[PDB]
Symmetry: D2
Subunit: 295 residues, 4 copies
């Protein structure tokens, strides 16, 4: 036998950081969950019980906290690039570092219509994420994403004109509910190293804001022919608004809301134009994916 691929590290590392402005007295908090997996000349730890090549996962954890102490943790594209660069520079035998960051929401509270200097709310489980792959000799590859953005529109979605054969029972519709959990990922141009990532730092928060804004406005305003056609519109707009990204990927479930025929009970009309009460369906669900690139 032979090792064909190997990586190891620390997952589910919870990290909080606070920034304090003691001129203004305003505090700002950041919370994330970090994973770091390393690759390199490590196969003998698997084949020969040679632990000399292992940077212990506990030491990887220590390194996350130390790096967070010594650097800004935002934007996450930058923090992940600094962290991954550390590992491949510090350790001659480590040749790639793979950093995932899940960013959790702590939105400043407004109290009596003024922002509070040190109190925050989790306004939803939506996440902002990065995957930063630092590969020695080959730069830094970054994917950015938003996930867990759960939305619903009650009309201005349609689905008709689909293939119909002996497996088909679904009725065409010109007016349905559409609800989904948005997972949207933008893939950046390869960066040559940390310096280039630093040179683009303002584009990271700006591109996440553009992706979110395009998602929300397109979802709300598109009289949707299908999940596929709406998601494609979102992707092309994001590509047109940030030339340093190469592709945009969407993964959208179709979280179904079924009409309920009540006409068996006192003639009640609850279907079609009369549909008011629906049964949200936990499973199954459609799942629609696409990756959009430039022509």
């Amino acid at each position: 036998s032979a090792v064909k691929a190997a990586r190891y590290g620390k997952d589910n590392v919870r990290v909080y950081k606070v920034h304090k402005d003691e001129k203004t007295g305003v505090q700002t908090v950041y919370e994330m969950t970090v994973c770091v997996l390393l690759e390199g000349e490590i196969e003998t730890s698997y084949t020969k019980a040679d632990n000399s090549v292992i940077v212990a996962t506990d030491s990887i954890k220590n390194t996350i906290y130390i790096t967070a102490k010594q650097n800004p943790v935002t934007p996450p594209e930058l923090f992940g690039s600094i962290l991954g660069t550390h590992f491949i520079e510090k350790y001659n035998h480590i040749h790639a570092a793979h950093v995932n960051i899940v960013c959790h929401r702590w939105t400043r509270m407004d109290i009596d219509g003024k922002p509070h200097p040190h109190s925050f709310i989790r306004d939803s489980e939506e996440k902002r994420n990065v995957q930063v792959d630092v590969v020695e000799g080959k730069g830094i590859d970054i994917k950015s994403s938003l996930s867990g953005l759960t939305v619903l529109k009650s009309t201005n979605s349609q689905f008709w004109g689909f293939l119909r054969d002996e497996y088909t029972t679904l009725k065409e519709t010109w007016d349905r509910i559409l609800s989904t959990d948005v997972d949207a990922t933008w893939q950046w141009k390869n960066f040559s190293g940390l310096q280039e990532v630093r040179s683009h730092v303002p584009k990271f928060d700006a591109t996440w804001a553009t992706a979110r804004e395009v998602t929300l406005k397109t979802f709300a305003e598109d009289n949707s022919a299908s999940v596929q056609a709406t998601m494609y519109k979102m992707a092309e707009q994001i590509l047109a608004r940030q030339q340093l990204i190469e592709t945009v990927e969407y993964s959208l479930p179709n979280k179904h809301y079924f009409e309920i025929d009540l006409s068996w009970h006192k003639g009640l009309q609850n279907t079609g134009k009369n549909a008011e009460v629906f049964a949200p369906q936990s499973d199954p669900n459609g799942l629609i994916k696409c990756t959009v690139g430039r022509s």
Copy 2:
């Protein structure tokens, strides 16, 4: 043997309802999860295989949807009272109906600074709940609550002066992080029946807004001596602002954020006034409860 207590029904019934204003073109959505458990002269279904006394759970489900078609589903205190009243009136042998409602958030979207007529976002997993117990001969007992309201303050929490003995290792602190998931419940005066519940309908949304506002402002502004002392302040203020509630109950976890001593690494100072990076702890957690009534 003998049956001492028995109840049965349908749980986890997902319900959506839409309201359409075709003068303004504005749609409004509501989504909940309902459970209904019935009690009455039903013991023979357990002891003698007598199913004649059972209102099938599927029929209970049908009844939830029909009631939702025929009535407003808001406020949930009203909807639960209508639903529970139906069961004890319709069925001579059913003497109590226990209705739980979990209300899910679908907040209208703002697009380009205007509210959208039919697009919504799940802005957090915070719930609004009711437990409505309709008991024949004895009125309607309602508990209202908010749950899953997750908050954090980065300073202006303290914990010192606690008991110290041979089991104690915890250091006193005059400046700590406080984070919790708020579960707050207000218990209404018994209502004599549906008419009385209807007569108070505006107080339900108003009291939920008061509880939420008091929670948020007290959490943000109290320089907290302990979780106990802060939660008590919230409860007394809610009681002073709604005379039709009898008690306020809080259940608050203390979701710990631990300092990380890094001085073992290049002398790094990250404790006390220098604390910037912390380790959020998933478990264990303090859990602090109280029920506050009037003197």
Copy 3:
């Protein structure tokens, strides 16, 4: 305002203990999750910021580990009684201690048909639980339970003869699937204190084994008229086999498996006696409860 009820403590405390027999070389492991909530003369911590009455939750955590070091952790009825007794004896102002224990499964592995001396498997998420309430002046109240025992029978369940009215659509059946997650609780006679609990220690594991065996055999062998009638049989048998318990409580969901009519496709017959492929339903679910006592 006034405090009407208050309790505080530590939740979600994970605990492992190992026993090593260095005559036989056999090791045995135990893993649980513990919560302890205390009551007593503590209201001033809520109303007056008086932390002197608080046994810090961290010290409660320390106490769980110390008690686990100094005593057997099995059976959980005993461990919870020792722990709760400690708090009300150690602290004059603490008058009740409420201990919940969730016991996790670590079943010894068999390798090449022999039990392994120190390797274990989690053979399901079924739990064994206790709630032990130690109340000064009033003894020790113990509830024991098994939960998360998930079972299915593919036939020999029926449901017919139920009430039928204008809310009913469900078809009678003489042959259905029955699946549930069993939650079964037995409530012990009040114990006067720790000595009496100790005097009954072998009855705790024996009664849990009886409850489990009765559950499994009755579920498998009863040609069930309804969930209610089967669960009642289980409860009466457990009461007849342990005179020191006063009541048995069951809470059983009816996790539905729906037939799928495929006759629209090439005449396929998949209903009634021809039913082979079914759609398991995640929600909603029936929920059936009863508490059985002695006549």
Copy 4:
């Protein structure tokens, strides 16, 4: 813009099937969760609102149930190959079908030491899975796996000799607890189509049994130098026992159990050889991966 990749279909489709032997009266149940994603000449559904190319996801769901009615659902490698082959043969414009199957455990009950003909238990959340990729022109690619197999050994694990530098605080150990959730995947030789998959059908259950047996016995018997070294041993043994698989992949978390120093309390000794009570850690966790192929 241009579509670079696209796939769509139905996820989270719950399926039960029963087999009845009415000579022996024995029933056997199978339960799974299925996902099917299709690829092909479908980009115009995204770019031009052309739904003519879409096989509706509801029809994909119908097709899963129909295929389950008409064929055995075991072994899952076979069922997934039949299902995926259907889509690329039925639809000229569909060129790949990607089928995931999660198989749930329903183990026959033993009652009074005899197997019961129609009653079953969920003996753990361990799953058996397949990913079957049917690609027109290019055969069938199958990955098989076991996941959620949670194990613990209380001794006969070590971790010493790892790299030590200014980021290292971890103490070497010659006797630790090792616990993990096993995710193990074997990748089969490409099959030319359904006929070849059928020709190997007995090897699927046999190879899953070999992988499980090798995992369990190696975990229990290896005096482990590290997670890496133990997992590698498992992989090489599986490769030596099934020549039709090309690689074996393991992904193992190191679910940490920390010693608890209690010597601050009455001199209690609970570390090193005296370690009996431990704190299981929910997060973070080491994560160790490797893919093993043949030399």
